Each structure stands twice: as structure tokens, then as C-alpha cells.
Design a protein around this ligand. Structure first.
Ligand code: H04
Length: 186
């Protein structure tokens, strides 16, 4: 099936816990895969304008590890619950992709999660200004705009609203699209 095929692809890139004990400032992100209308989509957040780190930006759910978290996956799931109401029975964590090194002292670990068909996002306004889906295939032929560095623009056909996606967020989206959609019969 579509979903079994995605998970089987994703598992070949799982690095597991290999880089998780290293002495960094530690953050985790959740890459949430949603199946609608026979196709896969990624779920994104728009960060609240009130926050210290990165106000108004498009990012995946995630944040800083804390002492309650049993491991890096737990951080990602805690933070997704707090931001959009995603509960643990509603997500299957399939793998851990290559981590992102930043600022010489920080390591960000991404997890890919398959989201239950009855989940419906409840944006928490203290953290998140908006929540939106993008079809995974978009990231193979994106609408690119140079600021010199590359920015993606996605317009939702439901309502005509445009979103800008950039940096590590855009990089991870492309990676997941390649892993899952490369070399497929039609
Ligand atoms: C989840 C941890 O996020 C960070 C941690 C450190 C620096 C930048 C970011 N982001 C993440 C993606 N959106 C921009 C800001």
C-alpha cells in the first residue's frame, strides 16, 4: 500500500540513536505525514509572533529537550502535543533522519511520524498562529524565489493564502520527498 511503501522507504535512512548521547544543546522536530485524497502531505506550523525564537516563521512542530523526556523522540511528541493537540495514540514514529548541526554548540534531531486519519489540528494560539498542509510532491517541483538564497512559495488552492518556507525546514521537506517519491511507477 501507499503507507507501507512510505515506511519501508523511510526505514532505510534511519540512523537510530547513533548521535543522541553527544554533549550538545539538544532540540527535536516532528515531520508529520498525513494521507488525504490518495496522496501524502506534510503538516507545518506558523510560529506565534510573541515567541523569542523565530516569531512568525514556518517550521515543523518541535523544540528543546527537557529533563522529563525519556529520549529525543519524546521531546518531538511532547512539543507536537503542546502546539497542535497531537496525542500519542495518533502518531507512529517511523524513523530518525540525519541531525542538523547549528551554531557550533547545537544539534537538532528530526523524526518522521505517520499521523492517524481522524486527527484534526487544534492550534494553541500562545505557540502557533496557523497550521497548514502541503502535498509532499510539491517539494519535487517547488516555486522558488531568491532573497542570494532559495525560498519556496506555496499557495493553498482552498483559499489563495501564500506561505514562505525556507532554511532547515525547506531542506528537510525536500529530503523526505526524495526518500518517499523517487523512482516510483505511475
Ligand atoms: C526546534 C528548534 O528550532 C531551532 C533551534 C535553534 C535554532 C533555530 C531553530 N529553528 C527551527 C526551524 N525554524 C526556524 C528556527
Amino acid at each position: 500500500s501507499m503507507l507501507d511503501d512510505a515506511k519501508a522507504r523511510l526505514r532505510k535512512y534511519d540512523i537510530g540513536g547513533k548521535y543522541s548521547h553527544l554533549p550538545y544543546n539538544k532540540y527535536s522536530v516532528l515531520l508529520p505525514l498525513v494521507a488525504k485524497e490518495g496522496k501524502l502531505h506534510l503538516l507545518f506550523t506558523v510560529r506565534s509572533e510573541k515567541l523569542r525564537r523565530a516569531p512568525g516563521e514556518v517550521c515543523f512542530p518541535g523544540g528543546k529537550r527537557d529533563p522529563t523526556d525519556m529520549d529525543d523522540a519524546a521531546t518531538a511528541l511532547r512539543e507536537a502535543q503542546e502546539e497542535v493537540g497531537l496525542r500519542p495514540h495518533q502518531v507512529e514514529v517511523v524513523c530518525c533522519l540525519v541531525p542538523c548541526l547549528i551554531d557550533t554548540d547545537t544539534l537538532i534531531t528530526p523524526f518522521v511520524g505517520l499521523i492517524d486519519h481522524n486527527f484534526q489540528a487544534q492550534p494553541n494560539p500562545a505557540e502557533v498562529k496557523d497550521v497548514f498542509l502541503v502535498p509532499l510532491a510539491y517539494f519535487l517541483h517547488p516555486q522558488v524565489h531568491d532573497q542570494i538564497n532559495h525560498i519556496f512559495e506555496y499557495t493553498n488552492p482552498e483559499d489563495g493564502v501564500t506561505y514562505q518556507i525556507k532554511g532547515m525546514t525547506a531542506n528537510l521537506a525536500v529530503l523526505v520527498a526524495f526518500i518517499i517519491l523517487e523512482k516510483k511507477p505511475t
